[PDB]
Structure formats: C-alpha cells, structure tokens
Amino acid sequence: YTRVVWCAVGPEEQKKCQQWSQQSGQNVTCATASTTDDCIVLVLKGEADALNLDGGYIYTAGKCGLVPVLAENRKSSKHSSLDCVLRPTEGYLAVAVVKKANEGLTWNSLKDKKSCHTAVDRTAGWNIPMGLIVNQTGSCAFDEFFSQSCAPGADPKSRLCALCAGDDQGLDKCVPNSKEKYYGYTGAFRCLAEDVGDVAFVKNDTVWENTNGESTADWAKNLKREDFRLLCLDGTRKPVTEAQSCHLAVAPNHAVVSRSDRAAHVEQVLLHQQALFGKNGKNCPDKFCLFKSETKNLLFNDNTECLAKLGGRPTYEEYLGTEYVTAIANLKKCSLEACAF
Numbered sequence: 001y002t003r004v005v006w007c008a009v010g011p012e013e014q015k016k017c018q019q020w021s022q023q024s025g026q027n028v029t030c031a032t033a034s035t036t037d038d039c040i041v042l043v044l045k046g047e048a049d050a051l052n053l054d055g056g057y058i059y060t061a062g063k064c065g066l067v068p069v070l071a072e073n074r075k076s077s078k079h080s081s082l083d084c085v086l087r088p089t090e091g092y093l094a095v096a097v098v099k100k101a102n103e104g105l106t107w108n109s110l111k112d113k114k115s116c117h118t119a120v121d122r123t124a125g126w127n128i129p130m131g132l133i134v135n136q137t138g139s140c141a142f143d144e145f146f147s148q149s150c151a152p153g154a155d156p157k158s159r160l161c162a163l164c165a166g167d168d169q170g171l172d173k174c175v176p177n178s179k180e181k182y183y184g185y186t187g188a189f190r191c192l193a194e195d196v197g198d199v200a201f202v203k204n205d206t207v208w209e210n211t212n213g214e215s216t217a218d219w220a221k222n223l224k225r226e227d228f229r230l231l232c233l234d235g236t237r238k239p240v241t242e243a244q245s246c247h248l249a250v251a252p253n254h255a256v257v258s259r260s261d262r263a264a265h266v267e268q269v270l271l272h273q274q275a276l277f278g279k280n281g282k283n284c285p286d287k288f289c290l291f292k293s294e295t296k297n298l299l300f301n302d303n304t305e306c307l308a309k310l311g312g313r314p315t316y317e318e319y320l321g322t323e324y325v326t327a328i329a330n331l332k333k334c335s336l337e338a339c340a341f
C-alpha cells in the first residue's frame with residue numbers, strides 16, 4: 001500500500017532504482033522491463049505502480065486508462081515566491097539542432113539527410129518533428145524522408161535504425177532503452193555531436209547541459225554551444241540562445257503516471273520520497289539523490305527541481321493539451337477509441 005513498485009526501463013534504471021529502494025527502507029521497490037510499453041503493461045496488470053513518462057507515452061498510457069499524478073518541474077525562475085511543488089509547469093522546447101559547420105542545412109533541406117531521434121513515439125524526438133514532416137509532405141512515408149537515422153524502437157533492420165549503435169558490444173541495437181548508445185535526449189545529441197547524424201531532435205535544455213564544460217563526459221568535454229545551430233521553421237538558422245524564437249513546439253513536461261485507482265497513494269509516497277531525496281532533501285546530496293545520474297536522465301530528468309502537483313486534477317487529454325493530442329492522433333493515422341495492449 002504505502003509501498004510503491006516503480007518500473008525501471010532497462011539495466012541502468014534498474015540499478016538506480018535499487019539504490020533508491022535500499023535508501024527508502026523499501027518504502028519503494030522495483031520492477032524492470034525492457035521498454036516503456038512493457039512497463040506500462042506492468043502497471044496495467046498491477047504488477048508495478050508507477051513510472052515517469054515522456055508526453056508521447058502519456059498518450060499511449062492514457063488510452064489504456066492510466067493517469068498523470070505529478071509532473072517534472074524545472075528550474076525556471078518566474079512564479080518567483082511560489083514553492084516548486086505548487087508552481088505550474090512551463091513545458092519544454094522541442095528543437096532541431098545541427099552543427100554550425102554544416103552550412104546551408106536548414107529545415108527546408110532536411111530530405112535525405114541523416115537524423116538522430118530520442119526514440120519512436122516520444123515528443124521532441126518523434127511526434128513533433130515527424131508530425132510536421134508528414135504534414136508538409138502530405139505523405140505517410142516518413143520512413144523514407146531521411147536517408148538514415150537512429151530512431152530507437154523502430155525495426156532494427158530498417159534505415160530508421162541504421163545509425164544506432166547498440167551497447168558496448170554492439171548488442172541491443174536500436175532498443176528504446178539506455179543500453180542503446182544514442183537513446184534519449186543525450187543519446188540523440190551525442191549522435192549529432194559525433195557526426196553520425198546531420199540533425200538531432202531534442203529539447204532546448206539538452207544542448208545547454210552538454211556543452212561548455214557542463215557535462216564532463218568524454219564525448220561532451222570539448223563541445224561548444226557556438227558550434228551548434230537551431231533550425232527554425234521559417235528556413236533560418238539561429239544560435240542556441242534563440243530557442244524562444246526558434247523551436248518546433250512547446251512540449252508538456254514528463255509526468256508520473258499510475259492506474260487511476262492507485263493515483264492517490266502513489267502521490268503521497270512520492271511527495272514524501274522527494275522530501276528525503278529531492279533537491280534540498282534531508283538525504284541529498286548526503287546519501288541519495290533522486291534527480292541525479294550524471295546526464296543519463298535515469299528515472300527522472302537530471303534537471304528536475306521537484307515533482308509538482310497538477311492543477312485542475314486533469315485527465316491525460318487535459319494534461320497534454322488539445323493542440324498536442326490532435327497532433328498525435330493525426331500522425332498515428334499513418335501506421336477512434338483504443339488501447340494498444
């Protein structure tokens with residue numbers, strides 16, 4: 001009851017959950033699956049209680065009757081006086097990033113280039129940019145737009161998985177979990193930085209956290225913000241400082257989801273868990289920090305200040321917004337009330 005089973009996606013999230021489990025006195029416990037979808041099925045079955053999902057997955061989960069419980073809240077400084085847990089969520093910016101040196105690459109010349117995506121079905125990495133691209137070409141053949149990609153979760157023998165590298169020994173190529181080298185926000189940005197792809201579809205924060213010494217990871221130590229450009233929809237290129245005027249969309253924050261009938265209890269445990277291991281928590285940075293994992297974004301994004309309560313006890317459609325929800329429905333016509341599982 002006052003015991004929550006968290007669902008970890010892959011081995012590194014499993015290991016981070018184990019630590020949290022150990023530290024919480026097993027007030028929190030762990031289940032592991034190989035993909036986010038499998039984790040969603042565990043929650044549906046009642047074998048896991050919760051996990052923190054990107055908005056594209058919140059849409060999947062929502063059709064299956066899962067609900068948003070609490071949202072990631074970022075360190076942005078309006079609503080000055082208001083406590084993090086009560087502060088409204090601001091959303092993040094979906095951007096398309098390229099190298100400066102790749103001159104004359106703009107939004108209007110992306111066809112046949114090489115792309116890096118966080119994973120199939122994700123907001124900044126997939127739903128937004130592909131939604132736009134299908135919209136613009138009036139075609140559903142989005143698997144033939146780019147010449148090669150790393151899009152975790154696509155068919156390992158498609159050109160959408162050609163740029164993916166798998167793990168330390170080349171296994172698990174293109175799995176939508178952190179064993180894939182180029183998975184997630186930092187994986188997709190690394191794919192661009194290493195010059196495997198021509199463009200990466202990530203969020204604004206990813207560029208900042210992995211350049212100018214902010215990272216220290218070996219592939220990122222020498223990366224410089226000036227060496228990157230954002231692609232705007234008007235066909236221009238701007239410095240990464242112009243994200244407010246050069247983005248593809250504003251995305252709803254990642255949120256914790258649970259089965260409706262478990263929402264209340266998952267909420268109370270987690271609010272208590274962040275008091276202990278959150279940003280200014282009793283036991284962070286002393287014993288354990290929930291929101292840290294050295295730019296790996298394990299379980300939660302590394303930039304999370306706190307998990308915030310959601311205004312208007314919203315449904316999943318209200319949490320995602322009509323704008324975004326219609327964008328997804330239209331894109332999914334290419335592959336009605338439903339639930340995939």
Ligand SMILES: *[C@@H]1O[C@H](CO)[C@@H](O[C@@H]2O[C@H](CO)[C@@H](O[C@H]3O[C@H](CO)[C@@H](O[C@@H]4O[C@H](CO)[C@@H](O)[C@H](O)[C@@H]4O)[C@H](O)[C@@H]3O)[C@H](O)[C@H]2NC(C)=O)[C@H](O)[C@H]1NC(C)=O
Nearest residue numbers: 075076077093204205206208209214241242243244245303
């Ligand atoms: C696009 O994304 C980036 C990354 O999230 C946004 O840039 C961030 O803006 C924040 C304000 O909204 C900055 O907040 C504070 O960060 C720290 C807090 O201690 C302050 O000093 C920092 O010290 C740490 C050392 O650990 C460094 O990481 C920082 O470089 C900095 O020196 C800082 O003065 C500030 O009060 C945050 O620094 C900043 N992130 C970075 C890495 O520069 C950006 O706003 C966003 N833009 C849009 C359009 O949304």
Ligand SMILES: *[C@@H]1O[C@H](CO)[C@@H](O[C@@H]2O[C@H](CO)[C@@H](O[C@@H]3O[C@H](CO)[C@@H](O)[C@H](O)[C@@H]3O)[C@H](O)[C@H]2NC(C)=O)[C@H](O)[C@H]1NC(C)=O
Nearest residue numbers: 127128130131132133134135136322323326327328330331
């Ligand atoms: C790709 O193109 C599709 C088809 O045009 C886009 O879908 C459309 O998106 C707009 C923008 O939100 C919707 O407009 C809304 O119309 C409803 C009326 O049903 C109204 O209540 C709102 O005030 C708003 O004007 C529109 O409904 C929707 N069209 C439909 C029904 O399919 C889609 O947004 C495009 N994809 C991307 C990523 O932009």
Ligand SMILES: *[C@@H]1O[C@H](CO)[C@@H](O)[C@H](O)[C@H]1NC(C)=O
Nearest residue numbers: 002023024025027272273276
């Ligand atoms: C877990 O058990 C109870 C229930 O909330 C609580 O009082 C206790 O502080 C928790 N312990 C930890 C370490 O989370």
Ligand SMILES: CC(=O)Nc1ccc(O)cc1
Nearest residue numbers: 310311314318319320321
């Ligand atoms: C469209 C949109 O983001 N709506 C929304 C976001 C957060 C929330 O707590 C309630 C509603």
Ligand SMILES: [Fe+3]
Nearest residue numbers: 054055123124
């Ligand atoms: Fe996301």
Ligand SMILES: [Zn+2]
Nearest residue numbers: 244247249250
């Ligand atoms: Zn905008």
Ligand SMILES: [Zn+2]
Nearest residue numbers: 313314315318
């Ligand atoms: Zn409502």
